[PDB]
């Protein structure tokens, strides 16, 4: 009992290209013949039963199939003896209608009486297509649109895991992906004119798109805008996809072809951040539609048990300002290397203020939060960095190492010195 590839209804018939169809859809598949009850193709007018004409496609599948040539296969004899035949297992049209050659321990089983039958095999073209699954899986998929510049390649590397599968359209894109991953599984395709490395034993699979679905945990689609539309539908019939694409420019002058599914897929626009690290981007994400990707290093986050004066000090209320400290409201549109979020007063912090305070610093932020009130507004875990930090403190240069100790030496630890301020740079040398 087979179901229709279009609508999922019971399917007694099939297209020559391997699509199971219900009675209704026997007459809306212009791609190739559909042998119906009278033994002729629907709409052929070979007899009076097949005179009603074919209708226009009811599915995007039909539009996709306009670029997929039907090549009629050879008419081959199927020899039958006690329900056994030499022909390969599959599905065939015969004078007794559509029949299946099943694999078995005794042999290739076929439910037909002894004889010889002229047989045309169904092509594999739409053997794995299921448009009700495509619809469902499209909803549970995502299309990651990249930014104008770079970074889209590095998003994938942070997301990919050893159990995952990455589908890619060409030999070259497959090679590009394999080089970017470093360690991955694959089978070098026959006939290729590229120099493929050796495949690893572990890592994500890199599969050529034309090869079709193979099982995995998460499935990705590389170069989505370049991919074969029918192959994409084959995948979406079996799994959901994370589909990677580039920034949509205004080029359409017949210059844009991509699978229709991407225009109805849930979309995620990537945005490059140059001001602070990824850990900050993650904490602030709830306030933004775009997925924020840091194109710079991790911003340090340290939870001090006692007050401190590193970099610019920030605090909600004027009452708690000391020395050259400012309010969080006064810090809007200002940028620093180091910042100290000073929160002595209970219930003094909301989302808006906290968002401003967290997004001022470039390299480090120290948070004095004795009331533990930042937790109730933000998820911001403590993050260290193996770096030698440096900043002024009331007309006096000072430096702190990776373990947040006030060391005053000349490059003793042997770590990097991160700083972007005008005064900190020039004073650093001399
Ligand atoms: Zn149907
Ligand atoms: Zn067809
Ligand atoms: Zn007919
Ligand atoms: Zn790529
Ligand atoms: Zn394209």
Numbering used by the authors: 4 to 433
What does the study report here?
Nsp10 belongs to the superfamily 1B (SF1B) Upf1-like family of helicases, which could unwind both DNA and RNA duplexes. In addition, this family of helicases contains an N-terminal predicted zinc-binding domain (ZBD) which is conserved in all nidovirus helicases, including 12 or 13 conserved Cys and His residues. In this paper, we present the structure of HP-PRRSV nsp10 in full length and truncation, which has a different domain arrangement compared with other helicases. The N-terminal ZBD has 13 conserved Cys/His residues, twelve of which participate in the coordination of three zinc ions.
The diffraction of the crystals of full-length HP-PRRSV nsp10 was poor after extensive optimization. However, after conducting the lysine methylation protocol, the resolution was greatly improved from 10 to 2.5 Å. Basic Local Alignment Search Tool (BLAST) searches of the PRRSV nsp10 sequence among the solved structures in the PDB database revealed that the sequence identities with known structures were low, with the highest value being only 30%. Moreover, the structure could not be solved using the closest homologs as search models after extensive trials by molecular replacement. We determined the structure by single-wavelength anomalous dispersion (SAD) phasing using the signals from the Zn atoms. Comparison of these three structures showed that all the overall domain arrangement was similar, except that the truncated form lacked the C-terminal 168 residues due to the degradation during the period of crystallization.
